[PDB]
Symmetry: C2
Subunit: 139 residues, 2 copies
């Protein structure tokens, strides 16, 4: 009983996407909001402004601003005085903002771990190398 790669990949992709989507709906955030909060989670130590976020997210002014205004309304982010330079304000995560990205991250992380656990360190390595080769041919 042998199945095509198409079938197997499609089944796996559908099972994982449904799992991810089912959980994102629970968090009431998008992948755009997730990646935004994520970039903050990762780089807010650098002292981020709206311009920095815009340059990073490849998004326009008011769109970034609407995205930011929505996130601040949900008390997920806040603005604060820069310690190095009091004259300016930076954007940072709230406590609830941090818990959200971590939950957001865990969803994709636990899904990865569940799969990684099934194979050895070399089997995982070989697998990804092979998935990479196949995808590359598909272009």
């Amino acid at each position: 009983m042998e199945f095509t790669y198409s079938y197997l990949f499609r089944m796996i992709s559908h099972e994982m996407k449904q799992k991810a989507d089912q959980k994102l709906e629970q968090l009431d955030i998008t992948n755009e909001q997730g990646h935004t909060l994520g970039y903050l989670y990762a780089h807010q130590q650098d002292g981020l402004t709206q311009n920095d976020i815009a340059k990073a997210l490849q998004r326009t002014g008011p769109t970034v601003s609407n995205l930011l205004r929505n996130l601040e309304r949900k008390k997920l982010i806040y603005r604060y005085v820069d310690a190095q330079d009091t004259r300016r304000k930076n954007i940072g995560l709230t406590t609830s903002g941090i818990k959200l990205v971590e939950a957001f991250t865990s969803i994709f992380d636990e899904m990865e771990q569940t799969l990684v656990s099934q194979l050895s360190e070399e089997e995982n390595e070989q697998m990804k190398a092979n998935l990479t080769k196949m995808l590359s041919s598909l272009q």
Copy 2:
């Protein structure tokens, strides 16, 4: 530079589905029509009636009948006297009907071959075994 399985599987699944869909549109048939013509291609030697097709396709009467009526209108299938029993008529593929399923089959076959070619016989075997194990955990 390591990507998640989710990403890799999704990319591969999207690349293949777009390729398949792009080609099915060209053939102007569905997967339902394809599998129907396919079942005929495979088992018309047995002498198929509308009831046999219905039992095989898990579809209702007029739905099967509409599916059949559409296929005959497109000159993809025809009805003929059974050789063993002249009193009855069977459903069979036309020449254009045969060429269609073969084209339908080649699309999924060439896509499979392109991928199978990238790995050795044991690498392919190991891969599918592993994809199977991972999907099973995903349930």
